[PDB]
Every structure is written in C-alpha cells, then in structure tokens.
Amino acid sequence: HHHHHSWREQGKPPMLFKRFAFGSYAQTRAFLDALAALSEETGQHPQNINFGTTYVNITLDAAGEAERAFAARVDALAG
Amino acid sequence: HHHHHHSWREQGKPPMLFKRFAFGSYAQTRAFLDALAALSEETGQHPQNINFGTTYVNITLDAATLGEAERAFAARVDALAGSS
Numbered sequence A: 001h002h003h004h005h006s007w008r009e010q011g012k013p014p015m016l017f018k019r020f021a022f023g024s025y026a027q028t029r030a031f032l033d034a035l036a037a038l039s040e041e042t043g044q045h046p047q048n049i050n051f052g053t054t055y056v057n058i059t060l061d062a063a064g065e066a067e068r069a070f071a072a073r074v075d076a077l078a079g
Numbered sequence B: 001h002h003h004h005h006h007s008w009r010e011q012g013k014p015p016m017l018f019k020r021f022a023f024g025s026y027a028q029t030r031a032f033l034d035a036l037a038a039l040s041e042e043t044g045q046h047p048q049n050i051n052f053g054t055t056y057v058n059i060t061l062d063a064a065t066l067g068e069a070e071r072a073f074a075a076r077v078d079a080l081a082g083s084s
C-alpha cells in the first residue's frame, strides 16, 4: 500500500499510463530532466512522453516485472 | 537526413500550429529537446504540448491570435532543428 496515483493498464498489447502533475514549469522541467537521465542511464525509454507546463504524461509499452520496476523508479523521482 | 523545413500545420477549433520533427538518433532528438527547453525559458513562451519518442518530437503551439509572436516562436524552433 502507497499514496502514489496509480498507473493505468490499457490497450490490446497492454501499456502502463500515468499523468504526473507539478506546481510550476520549473518543477515540470526538473522532473523531465531526471526522467531523461533515468532513460539515458538504463537504456529504457517510455514509448511516449508528452508534457505541458504543469504535467507529464508517460506511457510504458510491454517489453512485465521490468516495466513495473521502471514505473516504480519514475514514481520515486516524482516524490 | 530528415527534413525540418516543412510548414507548421494550422489545425483545431481555436487555431493551433502543429509540427512533427524526426531525427536520426536519440542523441539528435535529445539535443533538440534540450535546446527547445532553453528557447522556452529565453522567450517565456511555452508550447501547449510537446510529445516525443526516441526519434521524433511533435509540438503544438496555441494562440496567445494565432499571431506573429507564435509564428516567430515556431521559426526559432525550426532553426534549432537546422532549418532557417
């Protein structure tokens, strides 16, 4: 049990989707920088990232244990 | 090479400008994304949405309009992609 907003599983070949919210552009930008660093280190890239000034939508495609662990590393970065 | 000189597309009910940029590698896409963040901070102008993968970036600009401030932002984004 935790207090993070859940990742939603959807689509025929399943995907994990989550919308992260931030209080300002600077907080969104700082998170996107840490998310880029995470993908660069791991070689694991979400299938899609899209963002505005106060939100980041992330979609992870089925490679599973590894997808859930990457979603947990992203949740840890958000807070 | 990919082509970055195509026109921005005008689309949607309150008009928006839309363009997709494609790159040959993650390094090139990432350099463009980092330069786009610097541009937004320089201008204080932020796209409505930036939507990307490892080899492409889709940008949507909203009406402040649409006027010349939005078109000038679009042209500076083209110059970051190598088109001027």
Ligand code: NI
Pocket: B003
């Ligand atoms: Ni052409």
Ligand code: NI
Pocket: B001, B003
């Ligand atoms: Ni050519």
